[PDB]
Amino acid sequence: PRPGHIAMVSVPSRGHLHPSLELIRELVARGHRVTYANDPSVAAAVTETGAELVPYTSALPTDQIAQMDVFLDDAVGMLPQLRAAYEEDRPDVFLYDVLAYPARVLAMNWGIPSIQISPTWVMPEKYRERMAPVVEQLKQDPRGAAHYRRFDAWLEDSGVPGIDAGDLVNLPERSLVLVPRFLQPDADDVDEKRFTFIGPCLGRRAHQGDWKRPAGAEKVALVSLGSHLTNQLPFYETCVEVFAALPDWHLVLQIGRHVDAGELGELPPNVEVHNWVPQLAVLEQADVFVTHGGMGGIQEGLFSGVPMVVAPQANDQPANAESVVGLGIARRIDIATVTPDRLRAAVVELASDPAVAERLSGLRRELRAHGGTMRAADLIERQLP
Amino acid sequence: XXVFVGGXX
């Protein structure tokens, strides 16, 4: 179509930036004017995409109700900032991350179409009924009941009283789900008139350096619990304990920015430790990948055809662990209760199983078939005048 | 929401 103004809105939280960079870059490359509203803390990632950075102050940075109150604070703060920025420069369409749903409220006010960009699997209108007891019990707590009242008041004050607080956020008008259908739990209940499974939006190798397998190491393992809170030194010691006594294997242990404390005496010759690694480069030579099970790591494992040992912890991860195990390409463990032989058995068995390798090749072909960046950009352009 | 609550944050 004609140029047109596309407005992307997201949040500075780490899982909500990388999934769509290549999509925004593609929309810019197609000659559109793309503005990207986000917190200035992630100005580097936003500007590298080529879109026009529209700064706003995010309220996102130890209780479940308190965590919901922080999100509602961010929604209350985001909407007036978005309104002020775009009042005289209204876009043809609003693209918004799952946590940037105030952009949809703004789009409803101005009669502008909106498209949700979901970085992980969505919750279909059947997943929510299973959670209805949890929601009702929350409403019995005065803190919970106060929260839902403030949420409803914000909708009414913002000019969208006709929509439920759940439907806004989790029942978007249109949604691009940046995961393959085989990583979406209960894909049966997802209405694909509304949600489109795009898969990852890729756009050529990110570089960041090349990693070559050390000569004399027959198999390579990467341990990277890349969910920010990688504060497990006891598990890291189990990993070195396993791969030390596992010659012919080379362990690349990514411990995270928060540590590098108390390693060994220089470590066994098997282990090389980093605070951060070029993950895609290491996975290129990896025979197994140990991750928390975040959507980013799992899709990177699938893309590289590397079997995974999954240690789910955060809210997203348990279902992700179930999916990859259900696909027959992964083993699930608990960091608290995992044993050196138990961890070693999963590593050696997964890497040597030829049926596991064959399933990975199939998932690689299935993965790209969802359309990716080009299909997502084409769908967005259908919304332009 | 912690575990994904679906009916909110």
Residue numbers in the entry:
A (entry chain A): 2 to 62, 72 to 395
B (entry chain E): 2 to 10
What does the paper say about this structure?
A glycosyltransferase with relatively broad substrate specificity transfers sugars to the newly generated OH/COOH group.
We further attempted to understand the structural basis of the Kcn28-catalyzed enzymatic reaction. The model of 9 was confidently built into well-defined electron densities. The substrate 9 is tightly encapsulated in four α-helices with an orientation directed by insertion of the macrocyclic peptide part into the cavity and exposure of the cinnamic acid portion to the UDP part. In addition, the side chain of W131 provides hydrophobic interaction with the Phe residue of the macrocyclic peptide. The side chains of Q74, Q77, Y137, Y158 and N180 provide hydrogen bond interactions with the macrocyclic peptide backbone. Consistent with the hypothesis, the H17A mutant renders the enzyme inactive.
